[PDB]
Amino acid sequence: VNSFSGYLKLTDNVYIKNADIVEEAKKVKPTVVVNAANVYLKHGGGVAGALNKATNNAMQVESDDYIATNGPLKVGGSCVLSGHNLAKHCLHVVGPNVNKGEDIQLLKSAYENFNQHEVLLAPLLSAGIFGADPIHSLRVCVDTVRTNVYLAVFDKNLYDKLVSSFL
Numbered sequence: 001v002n003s004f005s006g007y008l009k010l011t012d013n014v015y016i017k018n019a020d021i022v023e024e025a026k027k028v029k030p031t032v033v034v035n036a037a038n039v040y041l042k043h044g045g046g047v048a049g050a051l052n053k054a055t056n057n058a059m060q061v062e063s064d065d066y067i068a069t070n071g072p073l074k075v076g077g078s079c080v081l082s083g084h085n086l087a088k089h090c091l092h093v094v095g096p097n098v099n100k101g102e103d104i105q106l107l108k109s110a111y112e113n114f115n116q117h118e119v120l121l122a123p124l125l126s127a128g129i130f131g132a133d134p135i136h137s138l139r140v141c142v143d144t145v146r147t148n149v150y151l152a153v154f155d156k157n158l159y160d161k162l163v164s165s166f167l
């Protein structure tokens with residue numbers, strides 16, 4: 001028994017809610033929050049910018065040090081950094097950005113990173129400003145992640161569409 005509230009159960013291990021992931025993280029303070037990162041860990045917009053802004057830019061400062069030491073992530077890759085005021089840890093995961101010509105097949109690889117963590121608060125990877133079909137992202141999530149994932153989808157219209165079309 002954990003502290004997540006108001007989620008709709010989709011499968012044995014996948015749950016969903018129409019919520020802002022930043023507000024959810026501030027309220028729950030989960031072990032792991034997932035960031036929709038890019039390979040440079042440049043947190044300007046979407047989930048990354050909003051989490052980062054909520055950390056008063058401490059996430060970006062930590063991220064720049066990580067990149068200066070390790071170089072960029074791979075598309076489909078991840079790294080674990082601090083969750084600052086929002087979570088114990090932040091799992092920065094790079095889904096393919098369709099708007100940059102990245103291979104959508106890498107979305108499954110991106111979701112595989114979630115399997116290294118027992119429980120996660122996460123957004124829908126490659127959705128919104130990353131340019132991929134959100135219904136597809138949810139399908140890949142359900143078919144790839146085996147650990148307990150609590151999904152926060154910002155858009156009510158999209159949330160309702162995701163639930164109503166879910167197989």
Ligand SMILES: O=C(NS(=O)(=O)Cc1ccc(Br)c(F)c1)c1cnn2ccccc12
Nearest residue numbers: 020021046047050123124127128153154155
């Ligand atoms: O990215 C999120 N949810 S989402 O479903 O995965 C992708 C998505 C987001 C907004 C729109 Br409009 C859309 F069409 C698709 C999301 C969840 N909290 N949060 C907070 C700040 C910014 C973003 C987010």
